Amino acid sequence: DPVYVDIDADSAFLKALQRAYPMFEVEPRQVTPNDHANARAFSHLAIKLIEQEIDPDSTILDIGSAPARRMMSDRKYHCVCPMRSAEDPERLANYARKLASAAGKVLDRNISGKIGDLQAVMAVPDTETPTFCLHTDVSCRQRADVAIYQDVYAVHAPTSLYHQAIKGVRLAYWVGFDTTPFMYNAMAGAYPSYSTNWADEQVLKAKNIGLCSTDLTEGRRGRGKKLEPCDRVLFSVGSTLYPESRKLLKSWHLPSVFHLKGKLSFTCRCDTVVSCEGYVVKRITMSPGLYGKTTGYAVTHHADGFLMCKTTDTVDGERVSFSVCTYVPATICDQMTGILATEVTPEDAQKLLVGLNNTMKNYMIPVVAQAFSKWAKECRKDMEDEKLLGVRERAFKKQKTHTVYKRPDTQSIQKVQAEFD
Amino acid sequence: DPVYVDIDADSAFLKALQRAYPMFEVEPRQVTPNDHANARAFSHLAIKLIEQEIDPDSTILDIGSAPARRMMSDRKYHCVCPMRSAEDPERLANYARKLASAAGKVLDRNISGKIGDLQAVMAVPDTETPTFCLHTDVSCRQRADVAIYQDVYAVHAPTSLYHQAIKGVRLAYWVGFDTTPFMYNAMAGAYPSYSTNWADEQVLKAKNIGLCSTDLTEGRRGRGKKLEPCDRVLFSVGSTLYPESRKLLKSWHLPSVFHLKGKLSFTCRCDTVVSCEGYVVKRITMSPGLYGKTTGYAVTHHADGFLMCKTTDTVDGERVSFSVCTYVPATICDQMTGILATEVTPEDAQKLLVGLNNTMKNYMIPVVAQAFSKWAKECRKDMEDEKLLGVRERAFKKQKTHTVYKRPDTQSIQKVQAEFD
Amino acid sequence: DPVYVDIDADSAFLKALQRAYPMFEVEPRQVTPNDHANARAFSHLAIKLIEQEIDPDSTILDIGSAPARRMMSDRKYHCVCPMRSAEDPERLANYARKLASAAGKVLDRNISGKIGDLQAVMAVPDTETPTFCLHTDVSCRQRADVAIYQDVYAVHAPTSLYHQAIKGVRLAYWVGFDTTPFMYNAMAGAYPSYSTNWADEQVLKAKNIGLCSTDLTEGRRGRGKKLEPCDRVLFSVGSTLYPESRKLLKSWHLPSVFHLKGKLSFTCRCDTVVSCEGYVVKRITMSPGLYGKTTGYAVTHHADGFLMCKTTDTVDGERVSFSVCTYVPATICDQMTGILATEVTPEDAQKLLVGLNNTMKNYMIPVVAQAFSKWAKECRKDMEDEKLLGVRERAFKKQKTHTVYKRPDTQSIQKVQAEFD
């Protein structure tokens, strides 16, 4: 009955897992000293929840899979395993090793069939076996009714979803990182509960962000003028590095209702079912035919505080300014309500935050204090420039905005595309 | 005997549930981590109350129903299920699945008849079966005596009620959100006990309201003049989005006595039986014949504090002012009586509110403090401009009103339409 | 033996109920969450007292009755049920259903006779059956000796009483609200122990009275001169609305002795037997013949404090002043004796009242404090303008009066009509 996860006994993330999954029993059982082990415990319970809420005796597609994970299970998967990354060959060899190491020791599974299918694929590399193939997502012809995505970021969501819509798939799941920081178009950020930092390529030589490296210098006295976000972004999960693109990340921020109308037509809905400090599980349902109208709005609910603030740093010796975003626990946000009524200095806020705090990591405190200090001043400036009801005075002047703060129990709303052809 | 609801064990809404339903035993039994789970516990007890106060062996219509909810019951429903929203095909598929999954396992119900009726409707899509149809509310011809509305907002109340009265229906129920904030014509608002925020479309790019998103900017130096509420409004319940219209929302704020006089004539009454921090249950009775006179007044009783105040914000860079409304618990209102005798500053009120408060959510405190501070000053200004009894001095000057505060144990009264033809 | 009433266990009105009815033992038994449930508990024991003090084997008329209340009793009633209100058909339908639901289950009653009488009335709608009719109070010809009025406000008392005087009735009862506030000609008022507020029609758009609604505004720079009470008044009991007229309310404030002399002559007396914070029971005795002389004075005894004060408010943007009346508990009045010796400001009075107070509802405190502060100043002004014994100095000047305060153990006396022809 209890589910064993690879976390230390006295870890504060266990209660977060409890609140996120209040239908399983969780017990810590540490084996290896993995430095990014919190993500595995979430993706570990996510698949169990999906299987516990899916109908039995159904065929399940798997886009970009590792077949060793789906070998000791009891459902009929079909693994789509192309060779496009440098880390695939050892995955295939590992699958082969564990297939050979249980030839007759385990018989409750379909090991013999899997071995035969793998040998058939090795023989002719164009066959479509029940449980394995060497195609991409838009070329596999194995018909099914369920599709699952796990840490898949390099596919374009509309085209991918449309290419399983025409194959009898009526339900899809997507587990991954929150897409919200890239809808706000920030330059760098962190997911401090999973030891993950991401940064744009043009700020890799900064000084005081979570992913950078600089040098010592004395200061020289010897065109650009445009410092704006670009497509290429670098992710660091623990010590593992992943390059990503902004367009494909943004393409998965789907509205509540949309239409896929090419040759065959479908009406699709997107809902968020599980959310934990950066990880989200999204369920998508599809049905043929053009049903009612679409608005084009995407909504995000905030259970914790979300901050995005301006900061000044030194990149390769040159002083510049750009935006950084982060997550803040709800308890600290609730306990900071009284102080933010007045105007406070960044160092006083820093001392107060250190006094209250460990609940949050210490390397993010100095920027949170500055964001709070700048927010409290803009609130006061808004309060002292009262206007009249229902009238605008006008060319009209615009004001400064250096902080965006989303408190818990609030919602963000953005305009996106809803008509895909 | 105890009713099991999907809420956490230590939830403060439980005692409010008892205060609202003092005829059932309530026990918390958490299953899923739903972020808007408080609505289900209210709509869950409401149906039991309706059934426990309705005569047995009666046929019940259901406008805009989900047949899966009324499958394991023991009363004769008739579900009107048109296909007008994108989420209807999944409801029909789920109904089919739960009908097929209990073919012979359960026999206490009318499962065989329901399956046969569904197959008959699938055969000819114009039939009128005892328990199911594919018609609109004004086109179904199944005669009955009771009608129920659940979270129905897109119908015009007089026409819908008139098309139900000519079919033998003498009693109707309506469960939903309070219509009072739209009678005051507010711009945005919240229902903080159910994690719901609503806003007008023209203020979606604000900064500090509960449903908005903005950007960072420096400030540019580069017609409108009319900022007034419009028809289209957006609702967010947890993370689910609903577009609504102001006219159809206001159409359900019915007076105590009204007349429906077309070809046949009816006299109708409207009464409120259950109210809980935003949810209301309304009972409507109808009788043939034009009986006595009508006044045209609608009355709302306040068990908790209601506030509507002016505020200044920045929308898309431009500084503007508009009105926001909210609900306040009764205990805080009672404990703030002494302080409001004198003139107080917003920050002192903020600190006092933080000291007393969690009972209320923290993101609404700063606007409540400002509303209280502005109300206390207008009271003092009224006290120092004493007039004479029974005489008006006159063109007459109007005064400023920036806050409307309805304390508990008070009533609001509005003028509405009472003659419908 | 115990009388079960629908109130919460820990309610302060219970001890007042015992103080008012020290011949019954009362136990609270909550079933429904009625928001105006206190008046039902008073009207419930009122009928018990009336029946326990009336001779057995007597016929009782019932003016404007609901026959469902008098169905499971053991005395011979005769219900006068005209069809003048929009809520009467539902009462008749409920009576029919309750008669049909006990055809043979209960036989201790006269159910068969009642059913037969109802069927006979439905057959010919001019018959006069022992227990039912479709006439008014001045058209029923069923002779009796006792009449009862319950929450009847739309009849003119002299004509009504005369039309049962000529029919052998020698004793009548009247249960309802206190008529005293309308003899003082106030503009608005409250009955805070029963969650009831009433207002004149010309002040429905005020701001801080208990029954009003206003809007937000900025203030414009753009005949009347007469703001006086009018006939039409609106009552709100919980959330139920009732319109009444001032004349018919005042007509029930009867003197201690009066004469009804038309064709036959009668001498009548009026006495108050039960009084509780706004609800009164009046007993009227009638006798043939013109007996001794009349004075024409009506007296009211105050067991609690009664206040009437001037106040300044804003109606539809215009600043005006008018009078408001209310009831105050005796304990607070007794504990305020020491403070009122000197001249006090409204702020100090408000703070003291909050300190002593919950015993009284918080929304009425600010006007009570102002009334006390204004009364204390007029007392001192009277004290410092001493006159000579038995001499008036005179045209004579009039002084200001802004507060009327009737302390407990005092009596009000008014001049009314006593000769009715």
Ligand SMILES: Nc1ncnc2c1ncn2[C@H]1[C@H](O)[C@H](O)[C@@H](CCO)[C@H]1F
């Ligand atoms: N067009 C594609 N169709 C299917 N799978 C694809 C595609 N491109 C890359 N992949 C896989 C890669 O081989 C990685 O292994 C997987 C990363 C998840 O862990 C996944 F991204």
Ligand SMILES: Nc1ncnc2c1ncn2[C@H]1[C@H](O)[C@H](O)[C@@H](CCO)[C@H]1F
């Ligand atoms: N004119 C209509 N007559 C009957 N039902 C209608 C109508 N319009 C929409 N609906 C239904 C929709 O299909 C949604 O499912 C229901 C929402 C409640 O949950 C309900 F609104």
Ligand SMILES: Nc1ncnc2c1ncn2[C@H]1[C@H](O)[C@H](O)[C@@H](CCO)[C@H]1F
């Ligand atoms: N002239 C009348 N003679 C007798 N009854 C009358 C008369 N006018 C109205 N009524 C009744 C109405 O029908 C309401 O039901 C009753 C309200 C008390 O609850 C009562 F007011």
Ligand SMILES: [Zn+2]
């Ligand atoms: Zn394949």
Ligand SMILES: [Zn+2]
């Ligand atoms: Zn139908």
Ligand SMILES: [Zn+2]
């Ligand atoms: Zn009669």
